[PDB]
């Protein structure tokens, strides 16, 4: 069971800012992480798989990257539906374990 | 080899290079002429009009 | 185990990427489906030596 | 392309619970991995097993392995998460998911959400 | 979780006809077996045949066989019973019935039946 | 095929009396039997399978015993309930057949 540590557990950033959460890995993964969106009481929505790519209909604005235990998502401009919680989840081996979450407020 | 600049050669079950070195029991051509977009659908299991 | 992804220079002449006639990719992709028959499905062969 | 969830239900302790996820607009939905995830209450999700339509074939998380049983109706589309004993634990919110084949077993698709609380 | 069946027809003797039953309510639809049981007014059941949907496997009857033609679609599943020049003694009522796999070959549901009249 | 025997073909008995039906096996068929009744006008109804065990939904005074050629059906009370032609179908083997009836009257 991969362990997975998402950092900070909140994070608190003005409108416009660039965005960073780091993902952490118990055992190394070959860049077999996802990005979630979830706002509140919503679904999570696929924003990035393995950690480069991103799904359609996601803005150029959301990007990834990293690879092993470390990985890194950043907004390079912030956007009010931007503000909600993220996820990570690594797909490496099975027993897929989630991030604890980000909480995202201006 | 010498037809034509950019022939879209494609063989299943066989390669291109191998076809000299083998012996084929029944032989035949099946010539006819399509749109460009409609090449692709001459393969096995393809879907097209 | 050959990891080579050199271009095949089929021909004499050089094959250094054009991927024209006798120059071609040596690596070619399964692209299994579920749809493809038991023959064609994929199967995960491990060797004990 | 949409999974559909039973509609958020309310059940008191020790009653089977049975949650339907339905897909439509892609077709061989059969041939897709269908799983469900757990969201407790202010918690992380939790993945908790996934099934394969077509041969009814089930993996589990550790943690929720014999606790849920997940079946498949292929005839009708459909992927069930059974709950037996219903207890304070198992009040969260369910989101049945989608699996793409092959390397990529994040879920592409997510349903709406099915709240259970006990 | 009951069987419908279609409404009740009337025609001469020597005429071609086709009555139809669709199950509803239950899942896995196909793989139960769906069967037609023939009572003649004022007479004992008489089982008629068995279809399976999934598969469209028959075991008809030794006094049936070879004169009643029972098929199935699972797509909509419905089983039809398909009678080819109806004689004077095919004045009865047929019900659908569907019966579970294993062991337990009774018949648990009954359709309503239809008034077949020749 | 397996024949059945069904005794009697028509019994009269009050609202409150104790009946038994019997069934006969031409062929041991084990405890493959299943006691059905049919209102006249209406599909008939299972009510014993494996010869003693009760279709749920099935009032309770029903009961069902026996095995290989003799079979009974006893019912300790009667109600207009119980006033339909009942039927013995055996499953033991294929070629299924079923018992010519019981009349049960007021």
């Known amino acids: 069971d991969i362990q997975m540590t998402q950092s900070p557990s909140t994070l608190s950033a003005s409108v416009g800012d660039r965005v960073t959460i780091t993902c952490?890995?118990?055992?190394?993964?070959?860049?077999?992480?996802?990005?979630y969106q979830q706002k509140p009481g919503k679904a999570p929505k696929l924003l990035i798989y393995k950690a480069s790519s991103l799904e359609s209909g996601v803005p150029s604005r959301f990007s990834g990257s990293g690879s092993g235990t470390e990985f890194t998502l950043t907004i390079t401009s912030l956007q009010p539906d931007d503000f909600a919680t993220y996820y990570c989840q690594q797909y490496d081996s099975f027993s897929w374990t989630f991030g604890q979450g980000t909480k995202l407020e201006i | 080899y010498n037809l034509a600049p950019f022939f879209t050669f494609k063989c299943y079950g066989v390669s291109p290079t191998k076809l000299n070195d083998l012996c084929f029991t029944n032989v035949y051509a099946d010539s006819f002429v399509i749109r460009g977009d409609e090449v692709r659908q001459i393969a096995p299991g393809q879907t097209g009009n | 185990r050959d990891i080579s992804t050199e271009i095949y220079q089929a021909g004499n002449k050089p094959c250094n990427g054009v991927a024209g006639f006798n120059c071609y990719f040596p690596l070619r992709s399964y692209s299994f489906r579920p749809t493809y028959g038991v023959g064609h499905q994929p199967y995960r062969v491990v060797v004990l030596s | 392309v949409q999974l559909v969830q039973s509609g958020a239900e309310v059940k008191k302790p020790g009653e089977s619970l049975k949650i339907s996820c339905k897909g439509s607009g892609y077709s061989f939905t059969s041939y897709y991995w269908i799983g469900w995830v757990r969201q407790m209450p202010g918690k992380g999700l939790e993945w908790?097993?996934?099934?394969?339509?077509?041969?009814?074939?089930?993996?589990?998380?550790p943690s929720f392995q014999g606790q849920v049983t997940i079946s498949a109706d292929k005839s009708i589309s459909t992927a069930y998460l059974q709950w037996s004993s219903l207890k304070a634990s198992d009040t969260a919110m369910?989101?049945?998911?989608?699996?793409?084949?092959?390397?990529?077993?994040?879920?592409?698709?997510?349903?709406?959400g099915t709240l259970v609380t006990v | 979780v009951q069987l419908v069946q279609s409404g009740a027809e009337v025609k001469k003797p020597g005429e071609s006809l086709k009555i139809s039953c669709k199950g509803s309510g239950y899942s896995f639809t196909s793989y139960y077996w769906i069967g037609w049981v023939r009572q003649m007014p004022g007479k004992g059941l008489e089982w008629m045949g068995i279809?399976?949907?999934?598969?469209?496997?028959?075991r008809y009857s030794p006094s049936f066989q070879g004169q009643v033609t029972i098929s199935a679609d699972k797509s909509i599943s419905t089983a039809y019973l398909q009678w080819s020049s109806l004689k004077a003694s095919d004045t009865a009522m047929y019900y659908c019935?569907?019966?579970?796999?294993?062991?337990?070959?009774?018949?648990?549901?009954w359709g309503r039946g239809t008034l077949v009249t020749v | 095929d397996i024949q059945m025997t069904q005794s009697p073909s028509t019994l009269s008995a009050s609202v409150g009396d104790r009946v038994t039906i019997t069934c006969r096996a031409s062929?041991?068929?084990?405890?493959?039997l299943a006691w059905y009744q049919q209102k006249p006008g209406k599909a008939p109804k299972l009510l014993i399978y494996k010869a003693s065990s009760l279709e749920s939904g099935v009032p309770s005074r029903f009961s069902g015993s026996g095995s290989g050629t003799e079979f009974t059906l006893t019912i300790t009370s009667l109600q207009p309930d119980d006033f339909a032609t009942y039927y013995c179908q055996q499953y033991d083997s294929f070629s299924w057949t079923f018992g010519q009836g019981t009349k049960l009257e007021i």
């Open positions: 019935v569907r019966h579970p796999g294993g062991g337990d070959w009774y018949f648990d549901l």
């Open positions: 279809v399976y949907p999934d598969d469209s496997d028959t």
């Open positions: 062929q041991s068929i084990s405890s493959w």
